[PDB]
Paper text:
Dynein, a member of the AAA + (ATPase associated with various cellular activities) family, forms a 1.4 MDa dimer composed of two copies each of heavy (HC), intermediate (IC), light intermediate (LIC), and three (TCTEX, LC8, and ROBL) light chains (LC), with the IC, LIC, and LC known as accessory chains. Cellular and structural studies have shown that dynein primarily exists in a pseudo-twofold symmetric, autoinhibited Phi state incompatible with movement along microtubules. [name] plays essential roles in the activation of dynein, including relieving autoinhibition and helping assemble the fully active DDA transport complexes.
For Phi, we obtained a 2.7 Å structure of the motor domain and a 4.4 Å structure of the tail. Phi dynein has pseudo-two-fold symmetry; the motor domains have true two-fold symmetry, but that symmetry is broken in the tails. The accessory chains interact with the tail region of the HC domain. As a point of reference, we looked for density in the volumes that correspond to the IC-LC tower of accessory chains, a feature that is only observable on one face of Phi dynein. At the current resolution, we could not observe any differences between the tails of Phi and Pre-Chi.
Numbering used by the authors:
A (entry chain g), B (entry chain h): 110 to 140
C (entry chain k), D (entry chain v): 13 to 113
E (entry chain i), F (entry chain d): 1 to 89
G (entry chain e): 1161 to 1353
Write the structure that this text describes.
Amino acid sequence: IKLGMAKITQVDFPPREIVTYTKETQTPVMA
Amino acid sequence: IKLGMAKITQVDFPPREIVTYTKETQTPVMA
Amino acid sequence: VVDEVSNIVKEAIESAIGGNAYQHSKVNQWTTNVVEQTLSQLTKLGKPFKYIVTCVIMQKNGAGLHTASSCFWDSSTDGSCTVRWENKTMYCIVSAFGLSI
Amino acid sequence: VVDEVSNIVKEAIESAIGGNAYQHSKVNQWTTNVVEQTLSQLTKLGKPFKYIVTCVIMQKNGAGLHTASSCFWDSSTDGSCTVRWENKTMYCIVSAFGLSI
Amino acid sequence: MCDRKAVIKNADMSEEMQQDSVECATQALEKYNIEKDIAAHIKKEFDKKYNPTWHCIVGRNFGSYVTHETKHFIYFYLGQVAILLFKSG
Amino acid sequence: MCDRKAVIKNADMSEEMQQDSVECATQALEKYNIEKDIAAHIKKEFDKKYNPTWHCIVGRNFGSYVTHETKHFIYFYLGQVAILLFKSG
Amino acid sequence: ASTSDAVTFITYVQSLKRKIKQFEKQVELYRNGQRLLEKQRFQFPPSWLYIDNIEGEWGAFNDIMRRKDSAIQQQVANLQMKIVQEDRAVESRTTDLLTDWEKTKPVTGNLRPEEALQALTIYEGKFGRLKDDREKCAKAKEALELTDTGLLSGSEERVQVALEELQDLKGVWSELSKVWEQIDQMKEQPWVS
């Protein structure tokens, strides 16, 4: 049994894209 | 090759459950 | 027969996990059934290779995963086949490592 | 040895990742490094078996991955070992196979 | 009732999410003049359109810093009452 | 100084979370003369404490409908602003 | 997780909704009463909410019950399907086990009464478990929209036959133990005495 270096399967899952921002918000005010 | 008595060991990570124990209430506007 | 192995793996994944409503007591059962079907496909093929199939069943949750299998043999008598399957909210990935005696 | 192989896999996991988290551009790299470390540990063991090591790095974001490996190998001479490594956010689910030839 | 003119001057979301919020606000304002029910309908539309979990808050003189995922804060103002549908999930 | 306390109208959450939310909201309202700036400060404190990011409701008119997960969900009135701060995830 | 657990939870959710219809009627009436009190200025003391505060607590309880009912209805399909499959399989296996035990119970010589009683109890337990699994599958299918033959089908008849054979084996175990007590006394009495 002869074993040697080779190339393995490169399977990966890309991550999700999301941005978390606590930006100041307020509804418009009408009298 | 007569395969011997072999099996599969399944040890999965626990998933996430939804607990919809909503605390609904009466939320009035200022009046 | 890498293409036949991939086709049998995809068929077993669809028959076991597929994309239906999984359960806590049924996700592991589906993964075990997929593994057993992969073993049955390897045994009924009759190819003289001690295949090792790593059945991967996961739920889609936005987390990374990279199941890479590395063997120690010769490329003339051993090989691997890649089949990719996806579900609505789960996954069923099968990779077999056919190694000759 | 099954116990020696599991201990070597655990030690290689501790030396490679251990309890730290992974990244989108490094999860597959960490999996490949862990698989290579397992293969090197199996090669330095001297056990006459064609080493087959699979390493998967999974994040702790609710993705329930069912890790298993079904192989047509004898129980008293060969085997396939699968376990899930515990960490803070990197549940490494690595399955290793050892088949004497 | 209320003719829900979706004045989304700053709808920090995608076009599909903004359209879903505008349609939910229009249907809710046609059905009834209830601010809480309109916000609930906008939240239901946001949960349908941008997956779990989503919510919408509607008020007249209210202050809430929209802190959620990007392209998930549907902000269409039915005049001045901005129904901030920030999907925190 | 307005007292942003809570009455027993609906209370299914963690006491530490409720106390932190009430103190952060009242302190931000006292510190920032703008309601939007106060909401921003409350969101900054909440994202610093209980991880980032989530949005809460503090205003005159408040009401919605969502699957409120426990330990971080309540529906009350914190003084002059309705206390409806529920974190889903 | 179990089929029987899912069926029991679905039945509990149905009964909870039946009680919660009147409970939410009382909660809405109490919210109206607290609103009338506020119309008279009679808000509840600040330590609690108003009567509308009690209405809000009832609404929170109703929302929690609705979420629990949604989870139960989600799990009910899987529960009923697992119940019906386990019921058919358990009915067949219980019929087979009861027949085998009643035919070939533990009839060895020494201490054989215990072995025969164990075999009869195993056969009867298999038959009864098959019948109960079929009944649970039928109930879970009725209460969760599943397809299960929970009636007195061939599996039910096999389970009944297995239960009868297991009752016969248990009676054999009892009679054999009664005989073996005297037999062991006669054997263990002193040879000189």
